[PDB]
Amino acid sequence: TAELKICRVNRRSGSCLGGDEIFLLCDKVQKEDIEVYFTGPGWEARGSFSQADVHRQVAIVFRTPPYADPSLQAPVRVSMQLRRPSDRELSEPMEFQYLPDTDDRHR
Amino acid sequence: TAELKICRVNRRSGSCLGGDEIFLLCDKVQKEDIEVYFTGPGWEARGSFSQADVHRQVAIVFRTPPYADPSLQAPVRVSMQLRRPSDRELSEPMEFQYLPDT
Numbered sequence: 001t002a003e004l005k006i007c008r009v010n011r012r013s014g015s016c017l018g019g020d021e022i023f024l025l026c027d028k029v030q031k032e033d034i035e036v037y038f039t040g041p042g043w044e045a046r047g048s049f050s051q052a053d054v055h056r057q058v059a060i061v062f063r064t065p066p067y068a069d070p071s072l073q074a075p076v077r078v079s080m081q082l083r084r085p086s087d088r089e090l091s092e093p094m095e096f097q098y099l100p101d102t103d104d105r106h107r
Numbered sequence: 108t109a110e111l112k113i114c115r116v117n118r119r120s121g122s123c124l125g126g127d128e129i130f131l132l133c134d135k136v137q138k139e140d141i142e143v144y145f146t147g148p149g150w151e152a153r154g155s156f157s158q159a160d161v162h163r164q165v166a167i168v169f170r171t172p173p174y175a176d177p178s179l180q181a182p183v184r185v186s187m188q189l190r191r192p193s194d195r196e197l198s199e200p201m202e203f204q205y206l207p208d209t
Binding site: 010055 | 114115117128130132135162163165166168
Protein backbone atom coordinates (compact mmCIF):
# COMPACT_ATOMS: atom_id res chain seq x y z
CA THR A 1 0.00 0.00 0.00
CA ALA A 2 2.93 2.31 0.71
CA GLU A 3 5.82 0.29 -0.73
CA LEU A 4 4.77 -2.16 -3.46
CA LYS A 5 3.10 -0.20 -6.24
CA ILE A 6 2.12 -0.91 -9.85
CA CYS A 7 2.64 2.29 -11.82
CA ARG A 8 1.78 1.25 -15.35
CA VAL A 9 1.27 -1.75 -17.62
CA ASN A 10 1.24 -2.35 -21.38
CA ARG A 11 -2.02 -4.32 -21.36
CA ARG A 12 -4.86 -4.99 -18.97
CA SER A 13 -6.45 -7.96 -20.71
CA GLY A 14 -5.31 -11.17 -22.31
CA SER A 15 -6.07 -14.77 -23.20
CA CYS A 16 -7.50 -17.10 -20.57
CA LEU A 17 -4.79 -19.53 -21.74
CA GLY A 18 -2.10 -17.22 -20.38
CA GLY A 19 1.21 -16.65 -22.10
CA ASP A 20 0.78 -12.94 -22.89
CA GLU A 21 3.77 -10.68 -22.34
CA ILE A 22 3.21 -7.94 -19.79
CA PHE A 23 5.49 -4.98 -19.17
CA LEU A 24 4.87 -3.73 -15.63
CA LEU A 25 6.52 -0.56 -14.30
CA CYS A 26 6.68 -0.44 -10.50
CA ASP A 27 8.36 1.21 -7.55
CA LYS A 28 11.66 -0.31 -6.39
CA VAL A 29 11.53 -4.07 -5.77
CA GLN A 30 14.08 -6.85 -5.15
CA LYS A 31 14.37 -9.32 -8.03
CA GLU A 32 14.85 -12.25 -5.64
CA ASP A 33 11.84 -11.28 -3.54
CA ILE A 34 8.99 -10.25 -5.82
CA GLU A 35 6.17 -11.86 -7.77
CA VAL A 36 3.04 -10.94 -9.72
CA TYR A 37 0.00 -12.47 -8.07
CA PHE A 38 -3.32 -13.05 -9.87
CA THR A 39 -6.45 -13.75 -7.84
CA GLY A 40 -10.17 -14.39 -8.10
CA PRO A 41 -12.75 -16.25 -5.98
CA GLY A 42 -10.94 -19.37 -4.78
CA TRP A 43 -8.23 -19.00 -7.42
CA GLU A 44 -4.64 -17.79 -7.32
CA ALA A 45 -1.77 -17.91 -9.83
CA ARG A 46 1.55 -16.22 -10.51
CA GLY A 47 3.10 -14.53 -13.53
CA SER A 48 6.06 -16.35 -15.05
CA PHE A 49 9.43 -14.57 -15.18
CA SER A 50 13.08 -14.94 -14.20
CA GLN A 51 15.13 -12.66 -11.97
CA ALA A 52 16.73 -11.47 -15.21
CA ASP A 53 13.34 -10.14 -16.31
CA VAL A 54 13.35 -7.56 -13.51
CA HIS A 55 14.82 -4.39 -15.03
CA ARG A 56 16.78 -2.08 -12.73
CA GLN A 57 14.45 -2.99 -9.85
CA VAL A 58 11.58 -0.95 -11.30
CA ALA A 59 10.06 -2.98 -14.14
CA ILE A 60 9.11 -6.59 -14.70
CA VAL A 61 8.46 -8.29 -18.03
CA PHE A 62 6.52 -11.48 -17.41
CA ARG A 63 4.06 -13.91 -18.98
CA THR A 64 0.53 -14.19 -17.67
CA PRO A 65 -0.52 -17.41 -15.99
CA PRO A 66 -3.41 -19.38 -17.51
CA TYR A 67 -6.79 -18.62 -15.94
CA ALA A 68 -8.61 -21.28 -13.90
CA ASP A 69 -11.01 -21.95 -16.79
CA PRO A 70 -9.82 -22.39 -20.43
CA SER A 71 -13.42 -22.77 -21.59
CA LEU A 72 -14.21 -19.22 -20.48
CA GLN A 73 -17.17 -18.09 -22.64
CA ALA A 74 -17.22 -14.41 -21.70
CA PRO A 75 -14.52 -12.04 -20.36
CA VAL A 76 -13.80 -12.20 -16.61
CA ARG A 77 -12.16 -9.60 -14.42
CA VAL A 78 -9.56 -10.69 -11.88
CA SER A 79 -7.05 -8.92 -9.65
CA MET A 80 -3.34 -8.52 -10.29
CA GLN A 81 -0.91 -7.48 -7.56
CA LEU A 82 2.77 -7.34 -6.77
CA ARG A 83 3.53 -9.70 -3.88
CA ARG A 84 6.66 -9.81 -1.73
CA PRO A 85 7.16 -13.37 -0.36
CA SER A 86 9.54 -12.36 2.44
CA ASP A 87 6.93 -10.35 4.36
CA ARG A 88 3.82 -11.11 2.29
CA GLU A 89 3.43 -7.43 1.43
CA LEU A 90 0.96 -6.78 -1.41
CA SER A 91 0.41 -3.80 -3.71
CA GLU A 92 -3.05 -2.37 -4.28
CA PRO A 93 -4.86 -4.58 -6.84
CA MET A 94 -5.09 -3.75 -10.54
CA GLU A 95 -7.83 -5.15 -12.72
CA PHE A 96 -6.88 -7.68 -15.40
CA GLN A 97 -9.43 -9.14 -17.80
CA TYR A 98 -9.13 -12.68 -19.08
CA LEU A 99 -10.67 -13.23 -22.50
CA PRO A 100 -12.10 -16.26 -24.29
CA ASP A 101 -9.61 -18.03 -26.53
CA THR A 102 -9.45 -21.29 -28.46
CA ASP A 103 -6.65 -23.84 -28.75
CA ASP A 104 -7.23 -25.98 -31.83
CA ARG A 105 -5.19 -28.71 -30.13
CA HIS A 106 -7.44 -28.77 -27.06
CA ARG A 107 -11.05 -29.88 -27.47
CA THR B 108 29.40 11.22 -20.62
CA ALA B 109 27.95 7.71 -20.33
CA GLU B 110 26.15 6.00 -23.22
CA LEU B 111 22.58 5.40 -24.37
CA LYS B 112 21.34 1.82 -24.55
CA ILE B 113 18.04 0.20 -25.53
CA CYS B 114 17.65 -2.97 -23.44
CA ARG B 115 14.21 -4.35 -24.31
CA VAL B 116 11.06 -3.35 -26.13
CA ASN B 117 7.50 -4.69 -26.30
CA ARG B 118 7.32 -4.58 -30.10
CA ARG B 119 9.56 -3.97 -33.10
CA SER B 120 6.89 -3.02 -35.63
CA GLY B 121 3.71 -1.03 -35.95
CA SER B 122 1.30 0.74 -38.27
CA CYS B 123 2.58 3.33 -40.71
CA LEU B 124 -0.19 5.57 -39.31
CA GLY B 125 1.73 5.69 -36.03
CA GLY B 126 0.10 5.79 -32.63
CA ASP B 127 1.32 2.45 -31.27
CA GLU B 128 2.45 2.39 -27.66
CA ILE B 129 6.05 1.26 -27.15
CA PHE B 130 7.61 0.31 -23.80
CA LEU B 131 11.36 0.79 -23.98
CA LEU B 132 13.60 -0.34 -21.12
CA CYS B 133 16.96 1.42 -21.14
CA ASP B 134 20.04 2.30 -19.16
CA LYS B 135 19.81 5.42 -16.96
CA VAL B 136 18.61 8.50 -18.85
CA GLN B 137 17.51 12.00 -17.80
CA LYS B 138 13.82 12.65 -18.48
CA GLU B 139 14.61 16.27 -19.33
CA ASP B 140 17.23 15.37 -21.97
CA ILE B 141 15.98 12.32 -23.86
CA GLU B 142 14.11 11.57 -27.08
CA VAL B 143 13.38 8.53 -29.19
CA TYR B 144 14.06 8.94 -32.92
CA PHE B 145 12.90 6.94 -35.94
CA THR B 146 15.01 7.40 -39.03
CA GLY B 147 15.01 6.13 -42.58
CA PRO B 148 16.25 7.44 -45.95
CA GLY B 149 14.69 10.90 -46.30
CA TRP B 150 12.64 10.62 -43.12
CA GLU B 151 12.96 11.25 -39.41
CA ALA B 152 10.44 11.64 -36.59
CA ARG B 153 10.36 11.42 -32.81
CA GLY B 154 8.41 9.13 -30.53
CA SER B 155 5.74 11.07 -28.65
CA PHE B 156 5.99 11.27 -24.84
CA SER B 157 6.27 13.67 -21.92
CA GLN B 158 8.71 13.70 -19.03
CA ALA B 159 6.08 11.91 -16.91
CA ASP B 160 6.38 8.94 -19.27
CA VAL B 161 10.01 8.34 -18.29
CA HIS B 162 9.83 5.84 -15.44
CA ARG B 163 12.59 6.06 -12.84
CA GLN B 164 15.15 7.02 -15.52
CA VAL B 165 15.19 3.50 -16.96
CA ALA B 166 12.03 3.11 -19.04
CA ILE B 167 10.13 5.23 -21.53
CA VAL B 168 6.57 4.64 -22.70
CA PHE B 169 5.80 6.52 -25.92
CA ARG B 170 3.72 6.56 -29.09
CA THR B 171 5.24 5.92 -32.49
CA PRO B 172 5.10 8.79 -34.98
CA PRO B 173 3.26 8.42 -38.29
CA TYR B 174 5.54 7.25 -41.09
CA ALA B 175 6.10 9.33 -44.26
CA ASP B 176 3.72 7.08 -46.21
CA PRO B 177 0.29 6.47 -44.62
CA SER B 178 -0.59 3.93 -47.30
CA LEU B 179 2.19 1.35 -47.13
CA GLN B 180 1.82 -1.71 -49.38
CA ALA B 181 4.70 -3.60 -47.77
CA PRO B 182 6.91 -3.26 -44.68
CA VAL B 183 9.59 -0.58 -44.50
CA ARG B 184 12.61 -0.73 -42.24
CA VAL B 185 13.70 2.24 -40.16
CA SER B 186 15.93 2.60 -37.14
CA MET B 187 14.79 3.46 -33.64
CA GLN B 188 17.36 5.04 -31.32
CA LEU B 189 17.61 6.92 -28.04
CA ARG B 190 18.93 10.47 -28.59
CA ARG B 191 20.03 13.18 -26.16
CA PRO B 192 19.14 16.61 -27.64
CA SER B 193 21.75 18.51 -25.63
CA ASP B 194 24.78 17.00 -27.38
CA ARG B 195 22.96 14.84 -29.95
CA GLU B 196 24.33 11.54 -28.61
CA LEU B 197 22.67 8.40 -30.01
CA SER B 198 22.21 4.80 -28.92
CA GLU B 199 22.96 1.78 -31.11
CA PRO B 200 20.01 1.48 -33.54
CA MET B 201 17.25 -1.11 -33.29
CA GLU B 202 15.41 -2.23 -36.39
CA PHE B 203 11.78 -1.14 -36.42
CA GLN B 204 9.36 -1.97 -39.25
CA TYR B 205 6.43 0.22 -40.24
CA LEU B 206 3.61 -1.86 -41.68
CA PRO B 207 0.54 -1.43 -43.90
CA ASP B 208 -2.43 -0.38 -41.75
CA THR B 209 -5.41 -1.57 -43.83
